């Protein structure tokens, strides 16, 4: 599936001063509805082999975050978490969502989705999350050891690595898929970032936002602390954690969420970009989760 083939099935809608591209399986159809949120450095294309398993059960939306995929670029090249939330938040209001939705999310898309859910709790049918931002990083012994890499990316070498050498696309992304991407799959991911310079800025700002205790930005830390607190006691919100084996953040997520009520776990084969190694098994687990939702079980503990 080429990039042009994927985006040919996608829509665009104005958002604030810009526009966002997005996949919509059933525009205008008020039914069971699932929103898929990608992360860094991917796009809605990441969900292309997952959505077909969910589409029979739900209208599927998968937006391109601002500055990414086929969505607009911001002329000031500010793509902090709050910048992204601004546009995603407005996007939610513009695609005719029913009263409650299910969020499926990955990486920084789970940061944005968790926060959106925290701020619209009455609209959350359920949350599927994987390789997700579930808490502030307080110890590098509980987490993958990227301390030195984050420091490196925060320095001036970050601009060279990403703006000029597109590090996240050309090295990080394929390093954390187990299979080898086809070269039309790789071009799909290169496509939004082919012009060197500031078009790649979103893939540099995103790791610069990572919520590290005593090193991460206070606004992202407060947002994460506050949706982590909410999720930790969200007994009324059904949740699926898709664990990637061996994964990247998966092991740290496994233990950060031990205490969370009403969360089931399913493990699949994968590193960070698990959707490219087990698309079908991720798709089936979502369909199972969605079939169980409709039973609206009254859980005891």
Ligand X SMILES: O=C(Cc1ccc(O)cc1)Nc1ncc(-c2ccc(O)cc2)nc1Cc1ccccc1
Tell me the C-alpha to C-alpha distance, in Å, between residue 6 and each of 11, 15, 60. 11, 21, 14
Q: Is residue 189 close enough to count as binding ligand X by CB under 6 A?
A: no
Q: Give the nearer residue to ligand X in terms of CB position, either 25 or 132.
A: 132
Can you tell me which of 25, 102, 166, 176 binds ligand X, judged by CB under 6 A? 176
Please indicate whether residue 243 is annotated as part of the active site.
no
Residues 50-109 that bind ligand X (CB under 6 A): 107-108
Residue closest to 3 by CA, chosen among 51, 65, 48: 48
Is 189:166 a contact under the CB 8 Å cutoff?
no
4 belongs to the catalytic site? no
Which of the stretches 6-14, 64-72, 145-153, 280-288 binds ligand X when contact is defined by CB under 6 A?
A: 145-153
Note whether 160 binds ligand X by CB under 6 A: no
212 binds ligand X (CB under 6 A): no
Cα separations in angstroms, 288 against 24, 34, 201, 247: 21, 13, 37, 22
Query: Does 259 participate in catalysis according to the annotation?
Result: no
Peptide bond into 74 cis (omega under 30): no
Let me know: does 13 contact 22? Beta carbons within 8 Å: yes
Of 29 and 171, which CB lies nearer to ligand X in the complex structure? 171
| Residue 276 binds ligand X, judged by CB under 6 A | no
- The reply to whether 260 belongs to the active site is no
Stretch that binds ligand X, among 50-58, 73-81, 204-212, 235-243 (CB under 6 A): 204-212
| Residue number, 33 or 243, with CB nearest to ligand X | 243
Angle at Cα 241 formed by Cα 2 and Cα 262, nearest 5°?
A: 140
Q: Does residue 116 have an active-site annotation?
A: no
Q: Which stretch binds ligand X (CB under 6 A): 130-138, 195-203, 226-234, 293-301?
A: 130-138
Residue 177 found at the interface with ligand X (CB under 6 A): no
Options 210, 274, 282, 286; binder of ligand X; rule CB under 6 A: 210
Comparing C-alpha atoms, which of 131, 109, 115 is closest to residue 62?
109
Please, are residues 20 and 80 in contact by the beta-carbon 8 Å criterion?
no
Residue 71: C-alpha distances to residues 23, 96, 102, 120, 255 (Å): 12, 19, 22, 24, 35
Near ligand X by CB under 6 A, which window of 5-13, 69-77, 203-211, 290-298? Answer: 203-211
The answer to whether the bond into 213 is cis (omega within 30° of 0) is no
Catalytic residue among 6, 47, 91, 108: 108
CA distance 151 to 149: 5
- Catalytic site positions: 40, 107-108, 131, 272
Contact residues toward ligand X (CB under 6 A) are 107-108, 131-133, 146, 149, 153, 172, 176, 206-207, 210, 248-249, 272
């Amino acid at each position: 599936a080429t990039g042009d083939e994927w985006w040919a099935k996608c829509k665009q809608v104005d958002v604030l001063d810009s526009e966002m591209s997005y996949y919509d399986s059933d525009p205008g159809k008020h039914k069971n509805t699932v929103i898929f949120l990608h992360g860094n450095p991917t796009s809605s294309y990441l969900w292309r082999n997952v959505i077909p398993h969910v589409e029979p059960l739900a209208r599927c939306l998968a937006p391109d975050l601002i500055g990414m995929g086929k969505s607009g670029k911001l002329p000031n090249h500010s793509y902090r978490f709050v910048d992204h939330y601004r546009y995603l938040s407005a996007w939610f209001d513009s695609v005719n969502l029913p009263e409650k939705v299910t969020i499926v999310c990955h990486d920084w898309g789970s940061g944005l989705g968790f926060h959106w859910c925290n701020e619209h709790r009455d609209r959350v049918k359920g949350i599927v999350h994987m390789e997700s931002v579930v808490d502030v990083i307080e110890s590098w012994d509980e987490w993958p050891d990227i301390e030195e890499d984050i420091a490196l990316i925060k320095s001036e070498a970050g601009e060279e690595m990403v703006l000029k050498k597109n590090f996240f696309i050309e090295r990080l992304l394929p390093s954390s898929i187990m299979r080898k991407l086809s070269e039309e799959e790789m071009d799909a991911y290169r496509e939004p970032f082919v012009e060197p310079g500031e078009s790649r800025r979103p893939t540099l700002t995103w790791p610069r936002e990572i919520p590290i205790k005593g090193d991460g930005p206070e606004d992202v830390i407060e947002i994460v602390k506050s949706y982590n607190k909410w999720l930790s006691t969200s007994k009324d919100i059904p949740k699926l954690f898709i664990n990637a084996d061996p994964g990247f953040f998966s092991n740290a997520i496994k233990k950060v969420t031990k205490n969370w009520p009403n969360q089931k776990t399913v493990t699949v084969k994968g590193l960070h970009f698990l959707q490219e190694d087990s698309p079908e098994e991720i798709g089936e687990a979502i369909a199972d989760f969605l079939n169980e939702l409709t039973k609206h079980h009254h859980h005891h503990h």
